[PDB]
Amino acid sequence: DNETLWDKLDHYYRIVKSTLLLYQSPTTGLFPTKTCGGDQKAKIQDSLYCAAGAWALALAYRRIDDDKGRTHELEHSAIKCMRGILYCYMRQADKVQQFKQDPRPTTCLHSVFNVHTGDELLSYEEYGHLQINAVSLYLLYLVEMISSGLQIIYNTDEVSFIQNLVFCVERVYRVPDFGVWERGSKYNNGSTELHSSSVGLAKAALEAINGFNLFGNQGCSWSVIFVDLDAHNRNRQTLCSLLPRESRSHNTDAALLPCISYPAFALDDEVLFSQTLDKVVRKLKGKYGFKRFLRDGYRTSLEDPNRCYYKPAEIKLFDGIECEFPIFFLYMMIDGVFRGNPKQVQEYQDLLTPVLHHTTEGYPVVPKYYYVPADFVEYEKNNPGSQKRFPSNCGRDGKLFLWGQALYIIAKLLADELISPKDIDPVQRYVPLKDQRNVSMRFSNQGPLENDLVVHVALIAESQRLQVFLNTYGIQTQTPQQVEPIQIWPQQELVKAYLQLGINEKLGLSGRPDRPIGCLGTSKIYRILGKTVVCYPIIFDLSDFYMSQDVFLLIDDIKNALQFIKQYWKMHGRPLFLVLIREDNIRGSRFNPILDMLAALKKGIIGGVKVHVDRLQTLISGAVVEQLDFLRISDTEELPEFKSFEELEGQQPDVNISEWKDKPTHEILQKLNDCSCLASQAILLGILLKREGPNFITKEGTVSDHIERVYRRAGSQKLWLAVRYGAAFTQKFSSSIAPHITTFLVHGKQVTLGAFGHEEEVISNPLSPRVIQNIIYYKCNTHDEREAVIQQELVIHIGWIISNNPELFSGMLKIRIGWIIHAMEYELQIRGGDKPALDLYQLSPSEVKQLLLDILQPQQNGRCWLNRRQIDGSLNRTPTGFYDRVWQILERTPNGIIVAGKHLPQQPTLSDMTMYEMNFSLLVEDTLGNIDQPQYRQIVVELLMVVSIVLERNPELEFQDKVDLDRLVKEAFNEFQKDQSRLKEIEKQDDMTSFYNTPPLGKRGTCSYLTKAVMNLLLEGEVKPNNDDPCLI
Amino acid sequence: DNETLWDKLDHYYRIVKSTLLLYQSPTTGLFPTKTCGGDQKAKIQDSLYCAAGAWALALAYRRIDDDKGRTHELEHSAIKCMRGILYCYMRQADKVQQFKQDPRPTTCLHSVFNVHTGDELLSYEEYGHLQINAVSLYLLYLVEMISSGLQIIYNTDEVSFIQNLVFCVERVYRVPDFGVWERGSKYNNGSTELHSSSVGLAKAALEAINGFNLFGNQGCSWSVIFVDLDAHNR
Amino acid sequence: VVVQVSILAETEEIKTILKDKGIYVETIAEVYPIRVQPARILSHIYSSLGCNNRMKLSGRPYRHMGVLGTSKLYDIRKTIFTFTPQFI
Amino acid sequence: RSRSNSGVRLDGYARLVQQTILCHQNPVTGLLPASYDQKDAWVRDNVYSILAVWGLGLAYRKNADRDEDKAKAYELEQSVVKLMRGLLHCMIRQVDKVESFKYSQSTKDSLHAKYNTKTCATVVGDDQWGHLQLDATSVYLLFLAQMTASGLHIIHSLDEVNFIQNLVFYIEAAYKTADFGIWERGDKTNQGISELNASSVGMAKAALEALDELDLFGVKGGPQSVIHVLADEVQHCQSILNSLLPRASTSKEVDASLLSVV
Amino acid sequence: RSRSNSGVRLDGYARLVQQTILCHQNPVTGLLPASYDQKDAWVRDNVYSILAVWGLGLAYRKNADRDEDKAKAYELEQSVVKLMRGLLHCMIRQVDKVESFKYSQSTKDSLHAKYNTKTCATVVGDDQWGHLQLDATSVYLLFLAQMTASGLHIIHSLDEVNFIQNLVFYIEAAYKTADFGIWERGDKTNQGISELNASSVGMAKAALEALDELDLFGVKGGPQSVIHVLADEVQHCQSILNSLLPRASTSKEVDASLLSVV
């Protein structure tokens, strides 16, 4: 090996010039998908890699002073594609504005373009253009090339579009997409899903592009890109939630490999990285490459090329015959070099060589995929990995896989140590176990295992009367006026300032959409127009919802926000969490709890979060303070001075709903004057807005603001009846609800919003705030408007629990809040006894929260097992692994399972699903959805458990006929009935109550009754002898 | 080993506060060579290494958020020592100039100073003060600490003085000195020899000092020190 | 501001005379673990403030502080300390 | 410490250019419209209209010792690069036209003088306008050479090198080819009669003398990026101007467009 | 893009401050001589004269969004810390003298108001000049507290923490001690009689109150760096302040130095 380094790079010089740089589009700089055939199609994602391949060789070409001009040819080969990629997106800047406001498949940036003009080729109907990775990979690569010194962004107008490109990528945590393989899922029905590979890339893209100057070394404060920390965090939360699964339909996908490595390295958790990794390695590795995913029908022998969609049952025909992609070996080879283990480079090089092809000139060719011939699909299905596969691309045919060709150049250079990993990844994305001090990248000063962040908390009082009153009890609250350099702003105020970020009228982009700023954003310190700004978190706002005025709720809203900042805030400086105390907090008995948290806040630890209590001037002196120059680069120094926080200088309802709603006469208006309750006029003025128009006038004025003034009055004086009708008949929404439903649904927890016994809407995939508004109020509930107000309460409370106590919502596939209200109200009937129970519409939100915690706790306490079965059954709490076990029950049962008029067959269920599959869980719930009586349902699941603990231990007994659990349930009850009749002869007939209070496990437990039932029915069939286990008799 | 890493760092904090930081001069920040005896002997290189140790402890403590002020305490103790060395040198800035124009063992900066006043204590005849390892190590530790965030150089006049120190250092290839051991050589004749240690330290200082903004991130073109390329090459 | 006063008795027998007068007071033992000391002990413990033996600083000289000093509530080695005013 | 008076007067100049020329630069492709009434972009007006942007960029780069001065110099220089690369897209989207005009010097195989300022496309057909203007492409090539010599990096690939050479052959026969000229009207009669106007030939000679032995990635280049110009056509151009001057064409005794040549 | 006009006026103030106050800033010590004739540096003249640099630096840091603005603000704040550390070194070179003043409230144990600007040393003896000016150290401590509260890290170690605390101890007894005052001449007669001056004790009250419960390490500090002030001494200062105002002392019907305390 005496060749000069000129020689080895010339070896790689050829390959790129002959196999990738020959086919680069001279006009748009793009890289066509099909090298031969005359196709104009160029994809966003693959074209990014092709430029990076020349970039990788370009960095290798930086090591020679005598490059004969090769370095600039390969450096600007990347720039030509990225600028052409950049050029394509503006061409669609109208779509970018639409996707920013309303994320949808029909408003997104496109993914395929004319290679020779850059014009749009396929419409939304023809092609699924929602591919977040392509936009995210662009932003991740764009900073990656700019950091190395390439100049792609040329003027401030491109800065605004890339800034707006961040605003689109900021919302990928909740917008589903078709993903890398433009299919969406394994079913290929055109239905969009959330993918970890797509979501992870945006997190990596936002991490690198945050604060990055698009102008490189030649840049100033007007060329930095600002990334919403909250939007990145919500995307970060989704990525760990979905993983190790790529999507709902995908248990594991080999497309996760770019997600956990080159280009993203988006996972900062090694363990997860390991668990994500093996499921890719174990389930998708093959001799000829990595299969895209299990049951992938892309370019398979059993797939009709004409149809653009796959039949729901066609999926099982793709099992064991998935095409193996050699490119994913090249991905692994880079992984070996980057993370320092050398074998992984060699073992995945030894697999790449046999599947590698060559041109006429000897230049190696990376095939796209290897497909098993239709002549051998049966043999391949029987024994996978034993039949030869034919390459999609072989060379000498005119077809080359440029994305694979690009990775080949990158991987070999790192393997040959012609590019060091630090050069090819300039904005560290792979950080070794030495994981400290990376902005937005989970590595704070403490590192990857310590999270004892000390959060800077400043106490701000609403009024001067308050701060003296708080001082008299030992709490030291500064006040707004006291701090002139420091101007305190509402979180909605930072939005207006942020509508000016990325504004360009020339391309017609409006900037950052009007959105609430989360805890992480409000945690920073800001400079707008030269005035120092500190924003108190949105959890102190009294407009979004009516749960914020309750001190006990505000007591925990501070607590979980403090926990949220402590664990997610991984920036350089310490966050600022301003606290704001209003008069309504102190007045009444509400002073007692707020003082204690203030006192514990003084101590230095709250909610397990270390805090630093001091004056706002002291707490801001040297921290890294966020710069708001875009409000000044447009010369808007005379922008209106943003409105800082300003210092301020008893019976049950005697009127029943049915009593006067049924009353026909319109005299009820006189009753409004006759009645004196605050909750009353919440209704009379509420029906007034419906009965005689929206903006009718009365004694005080237009009725529209009276309901609002009542709600303002009601919330402060804490008669929570009126504050619920007032908040219902005015149709208000909390902005925190919109991504609450997203958070539940990305955990696999299906959300439905409809009252018990009324129409319920299934939210399978997440929707936008506009859509959920009509579902909350208009279409779902019309019997009572106040149903939404209580409905809107828990979905914030559920969001609180799912974060603080994730385990508490385990076992339930779906959180039906409407049934939770029925569960919520029914337990009070048990709690109240022979007394008119407390109304759920009368309790304060903390009581609703504490009620929610009490009855959704684990071991329900002191409940006759009847009440446990009511709570658990109405709550749809299923045992851990219940869905797994019924699959096993469904596996060795010929005639499936019948539950109260539904039929769960063995086929096509077994062929179309997997034992861990998420889709199967819905079907069994659909099978059990008809159980009207909740304790019957819990009896059904234990019976379903009972056969499971029966069947798996007892592998010889199989069903012969259909399994109707109702017959299994009753026969257990009658044989139950005879024994207790033998004891005391209970005269109640057809009453399940004696069965429900019976404990599952005990002397004569419900399980013991149930297994006898399942023992007999199994015993009425053939006892199959095992080949594995010989029989002694 | 379930010891929390705070206890691990508190061990070395103890060691530093008891054995090293207990002796720092409040008036000059220098660390006396003799801990007991009443001797006012303060060596520039000795105090430089002491400040380096305190700075290393501060870098360690930087990883814990609830530091109880220890990161600042150690960082600014090191800064205090480094600034006391600077004060001692700008007290001799006339000798800085007269060494710049003509290096000589009777024209050099002193390598020892009064720990409690910062003034010169031993004259040229008494002690061999030409130790390039002192000023070169000063520049090296200065650039190391400013790069780590230790804000040491304060105004542009300190910038000019440090640059003139670079001017003195650039000449070391042709300046024979007494070395780190202030003896000159084996024979102990008070004779001046060219030392590999001193020229290497000066080369490292010139490499790091070159194009270095003494103001850290908080600086502009007028705080960057420029180093003669040829001089460093020689 | 309003000034809080904790009326205290040395022994149970002085507490009984006050109780006979309808006065509810605690002893030096009932106030425990809160520990009550005179102002001279305050002046002494405050002399350890700013002490540096190498810098030959030995803290504050013994100075009498008025009712302002004794009316603050002190925590010394995680123990609540109250010092009585010097006019007694 | 403070910005020099050159810097402040340059900031005034930058506000002038922003308000006048650069605020109509179409962000998508970097081209400029003619007016608000006529929305399309001429390649000649585009190449010339960024001369002020170029001068601002070089003037700022001379005193670019600070972050903001460096960034504004970068913005001006790369706005210039944006416009000339957008025009490169416009020209390369008619590569067949360049190839045809290389052999058959017809007016129907010519690069359009105007392009869609929004999509780098041809708004009008090959016959709805007089498109063959061999001084507009000439000024484009001449300024491309001048920018590459001053360090601006406009072209990025060897395909761009080959297209620039085929443009060289497009402008090579400008001395023997009749064109509508700088005023898009041919002769004085304004009847679609293309004529050999001296401005086109002179700008052709200027570009050809500019693009000789000029490495077109700049200092970071090699033999593959040398643009090769035969001096034979250059000297034929000079001879034709010598025969023409002070006349601009056979039909015009003098045209002021010769100020773009002298 | 360009610097704000406020920045223009602020560089104007920069030239003004540079040519008046900061041009005499002694390099080695950071102190400021009174004049070319009086080549010594007073504590109070230095502390009051560095205020301009503080104000200019804080003004720049308000608009510190560009690198050179950061540099100017840093220059001024670190010139402030330079002067104040030079003065701290001058005081701490005389620690035995503060120690003697602590228990002996004598005029012979008072820190010299003037020091050698070139070596942080003593120019004249303890009896050659009127040195007890409890309003020089008072304003020094007050502005030390205010710069620590404003982001300036002046003290650098716990030894300086105890020195500043023992200097509060030095000043806590200003109400019950006669000093030669702001004008270095004692009583009205100017005959070596020290008198209780209102400005001195008011400055002492300000230093005691402002520095009370303050972290000399700044925000990045701990319990070892908080310097504790008893409210009793500062309120005695306040009491004899009202009892003695509107006069300046027993022999002084009025002084314009009461402007420093009101």
Ligand SMILES: *C/C=C(\C)CC/C=C(\C)CCC=C(C)C
């Ligand atoms: C050898 C296999 C045989 C004999 C199948 C019949 C056996 C049973 C029926 C008993 C199975 C029940 C239990 C193991 C609990």
